[PDB]
């Protein structure tokens, strides 16, 4: 089993509730220059990484109903760039690297979104993926768009309706061989160009699709929802599921559950790929790696943690002493919070948040120790790959590539280069660039008997 | 002496404007869906010092009597196409000075995500982005695709005004130009320089912060075309560069004066709005070889195309009349307004004109000196600031203009020798910095 590796990026300086931008080796304060992205992409492509994944966000920080000064002083939330634009600009400087971007079913218009993603897939020759997001933090983003809030219980129903429409546009509107472009013959075969018809609870569309059938048809579908409804959505539509950090026995159960959901959806258990978020700090000795991790933590302003904790969870902890038990708060807590905080103090909670926010806890050690950790995760939890989540850029990515990946390649668990041109062929380990027949999007193909 | 600016009119699809010469052996835009076609075009333009490449856009498709007929696919008349923002982003990495201008529709875009998309292009390109502000579109097809109702024809410019006010607030007022400090020993950004916007218009609403900080140009260079009195009022308020269609010097000159008067009425300097005329040509060493070169272009287009695309573009289906019939005499209601121009022409005459150029301008056909003389006479007679080159065959029409006509214009001193500034606004408007002029309405939305 050869594992796949991708890089997690954000088109902004800080991510995931942390703020290590002041670290002397951190360069992502330069996120708004193309040279930052060209350098990152060339590092990944020279190493044979399977893809770079661009996360996204639409909203901003909300601490007690306002956006406090510390959000600007430490660049906690803003500004950012549009990931589709970054992805498109990286097409020109890469040839094999996959490019994966977040796109929101809550805020995108499906018809223009389908044309945009298919245009990326044409120009890149089949290297595009889409991380399907439905939630976010939604409250700020909705006021930015002037649109009403969609209840949390309906967001995945809206996402289901969104998927049905983009499947019609990507798979049902133009047959794969419709374009002929023979100057002495036909431009296109009119019998292979179809009007679509869609009338759902949230979206409606009637008529032709702008873009013809792209090299992959549908971009590789990534998904990371962790709620019960979110895992059902991923088991039905996701080809690659991103899992956040957890102990090996918990990851193993999550993987088992997701494969079982895929099976209940009529898909082969191994036709869905599971990739875990993975962070590391690498140095030539274990003691130096521990010290290097401490220096990352020391680079974050101490006041950040309590602000970003309130933003991400809604719980404001600023007024309390660090020794205050989490049982003795003023507010009442969901049951979930009382179980997770059992025996902890405010200082415990903020110190843990300071260290990694919602990012995975890093594996800290020598190159061989980090490589051993990767193999134990993969064998212990039945994983198909890892999403590298850097703590400092570009250094965290360079360190992994230069010191860890060679050990993994020697051990036979990482590939040596690029043996397939499209993202789907490489990730799904097939010689077919289009969706599998047991995937829902395949049911919309006109050449296979779909309606209209 | 006025130094004219030049841009290239492109389309992210094979055929445009109701014509279809894709079958010509030298036409390469059947490969519009490959990056190599666009890399090549952009490199030709940038090496020549052309100010920009302009990517038009469309969301609809052909309608003839409520059908999309088979000829549309057999000849690629309308579809398929690519998204022009994605093409433009992909050209950033292979260019350094070239302007990238793209159509964006105020009828269909959401202003908050559009503002972020355009400012992201502007950041990554270092201030080379333009936006052709489109306020029209087939309320039938494009709106059935999006599942939204037809915004009333007589309210489209009111909706566009509200769109503009909001994207101005996001681009100019949400983040001050120097808000980002990125000092690891100091502050990342100055909180006093990051502002919540509040907008409550008849069509759009937004409350909160903007995703993108102040981009190199602030606002993309604003292009506009629109013939009506209301469209001239809109262009005179918002447009920095105005595209005019094909017209003889007297009418072109009157349109230039009217548009500058509208800019003046909005408190702008009369010369701070630039007028660019569409221009097409076929060039060859002798006049006779140029006539023959054009004829081969016309001969490459299938005869049955013209009557089909004419019905699509105008709603008038001429397919059932023999070519002898005249248009003032047989069948169907005409508007008392439009159809006078049909006097003294047969059906075959209309379709022969339409076959030649569709909605594009009639090409100037001749020698390099004849084409250069046409350009200078248009510019001097109409007080134009530049020209939008519309090719008949790509890439050859662009190559021929660059290799044979542009040197003459430069030798005569009516075109600059090369790039004079790195950003699009500095080149087109002569500003001292890349940001909007202080007398442009968009600058009124800057903070303080």
């Amino acid at each position: 089993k050869q594992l796949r590796f991708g890089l997690f990026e954000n088109a902004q300086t800080n991510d995931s509730g942390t703020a290590t931008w002041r670290h002397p080796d951190n360069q992502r304060h330069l996120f708004d220059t193309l040279d930052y992205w060209r350098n990152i992409a060339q590092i990944c492509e020279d190493a044979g990484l399977d893809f770079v994944f661009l996360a996204d966000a639409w909203g901003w920080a909300d601490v007690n109903g306002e956006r406090p000064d510390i959000c600007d002083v430490e660049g906690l939330d803003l500004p950012r760039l549009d990931p589709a634009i970054v992805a498109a600009a990286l097409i020109a400087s890469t040839t094999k690297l996959g490019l994966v971007m977040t796109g929101s079913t809550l805020l995108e218009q499906p018809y223009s979104f389908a044309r945009r993603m298919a245009s990326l897939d044409h120009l890149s020759k089949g290297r595009i993926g889409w991380n399907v997001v439905t939630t976010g933090t939604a409250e700020t983003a909705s006021a930015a768009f002037g649109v009403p809030m969609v209840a949390h219980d309906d967001r995945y129903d809206m996402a289901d309706d969104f998927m049905e429409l983009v499947y019609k546009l990507w798979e049902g509107a133009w047959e794969p061989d419709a374009l002929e472009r023979d100057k002495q013959g036909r431009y296109a075969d009119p019998a292979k160009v179809h009007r679509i018809d869609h009338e759902g609870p949230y979206f409606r569309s009637n008529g032709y699709g702008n873009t013809s059938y792209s090299p992959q048809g549908t971009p590789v579908l990534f998904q990371a929802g962790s709620s019960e409804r979110g895992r059902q959505f991923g088991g039905r539509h996701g080809e690659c599921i991103f899992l956040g950090g957890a102990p090996i026995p918990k990851l193993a159960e999550q993987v088992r559950a997701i494969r079982a959901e895929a099976v209940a959806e009529g898909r082969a258990a191994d036709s869905i790929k599971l990739m875990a978020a993975f962070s590391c700090v690498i140095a030539p000795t274990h003691e130096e790696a521990v010290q290097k991790y401490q220096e990352v933590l020391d680079s974050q302003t101490p006041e950040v943690a309590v602000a970003s904790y309130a933003w991400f969870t809604g719980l404001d902890l600023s007024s309390y002493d660090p020794s205050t038990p989490m049982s003795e708060l003023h507010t009442e807590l969901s049951q979930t919070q009382v179980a997770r905080f059992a025996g902890l103090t405010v200082g415990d909670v903020l110190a843990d948040w300071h260290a990694h926010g919602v990012r995975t806890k890093p594996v800290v050690g020598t190159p061989e120790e980090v490589a051993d950790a990767i193999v134990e995760l993969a064998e212990g939890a039945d994983l198909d790959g890892f999403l590298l989540t850097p703590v400092i850029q570009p250094g965290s990515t360079i360190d992994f590539i230069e010191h860890v990946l060679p050990i993994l390649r020697e051990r036979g668990v990482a590939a040596s280069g690029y043996d397939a041109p499209t993202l789907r062929e490489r990730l799904l380990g097939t010689e077919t660039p289009v969706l599998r027949e047991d995937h829902p999007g395949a049911g919309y193909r006109a050449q296979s008997g779909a309606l209209v």
Side-chain angles (χ1 to χ4, degrees), chain A residues 75 152 265 311 361 403:
Chain A
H152 311 86
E265 280 284 317
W311 171 23
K361 307 188 180 174
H403 306 306

Side-chain angles (χ1 to χ4, degrees), chain A residues 1-5 371-372 374-375 378-379 383-384 386 404-417:
Chain A
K1 179 177 243 183
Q2 312 268 115
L3 306 169
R4 320 316 307 194
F5 294 89
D372 288 350
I374 285 171
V375 173
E379 297 179 352
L383 295 168
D384 303 293
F386 294 88
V404 174
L405 201 52
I407 299 171
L408 298 172
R409 293 185 161 148
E410 180 51 35
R411 288 174 182 178
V413 296
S416 292

Side-chain angles (χ1 to χ4, degrees), chain A residues 72-277:
Chain A
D72 288 315
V73 173
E74 305 287 343
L76 295 185
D77 54 345
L78 289 182
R80 60 180 72 104
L81 300 185
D82 182 41
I85 296 308
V86 179
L90 286 179
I91 294 176
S93 54
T94 55
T95 59
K96 308 310 237 191
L97 181 69
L99 312 163
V100 181
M101 41 170 285
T102 285
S104 172
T105 60
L106 181 73
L107 300 166
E108 294 282 345
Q109 306 165 298
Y111 192 86
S112 51
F113 179 78
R115 185 178 88 159
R116 186 177 311 121
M117 302 298 299
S119 296
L120 285 156
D121 200 55
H122 278 283
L123 293 183
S124 71
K125 301 173 179 166
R127 294 186 285 130
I128 303 305
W130 169 30
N131 175 43
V132 184
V133 304
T134 84
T135 66
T137 303
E139 195 246 318
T140 50
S142 286
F145 284 79
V147 295
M149 203 83 163
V150 174
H152 311 86
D153 70 274
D154 292 340
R155 286 175 191 172
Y156 274 106
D157 294 340
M158 179 181 252
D160 282 325
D161 196 25
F162 193 108
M163 300 306 298
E164 182 174 330
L165 181 44
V166 294
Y167 290 150
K168 289 173 174 175
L169 294 161
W170 287 329
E171 307 283 333
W174 293 76
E175 295 186 31
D177 54 331
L179 285 187
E180 306 177 347
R181 295 181 280 191
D182 176 16
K183 295 188 180 182
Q184 283 73 228
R186 295 186 299 205
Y187 185 84
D189 177 358
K192 299 182 182 182
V193 185
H194 310 282
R195 171 183 291 269
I196 68 147
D197 177 86
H198 181 84
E199 168 62 273
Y202 299 91
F203 305 103
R204 157 162 62 198
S205 184
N206 298 264
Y208 293 82
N210 268 226
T211 56
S212 69
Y213 200 87
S214 73
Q216 292 183 127
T218 291
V220 181
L221 302 179
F222 292 73
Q223 204 268 338
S226 57
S227 66
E228 185 205 290
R229 186 65 182 78
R231 289 290 161 75
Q232 290 184 25
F233 186 90
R236 171 160 176 81
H237 301 282
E239 297 174 281
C240 184
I241 306 301
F242 289 142
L243 297 181
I248 286 182
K250 302 208 169 170
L251 275 175
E253 167 57 28
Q254 289 167 26
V255 171
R256 184 212 63 78
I258 288 162
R259 292 199 196 288
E261 183 71 44
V263 166
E265 280 284 317
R267 304 171 65 191
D270 67 293
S271 70
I272 190 162
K273 304 299 177 189
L274 280 298
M275 300 182 68

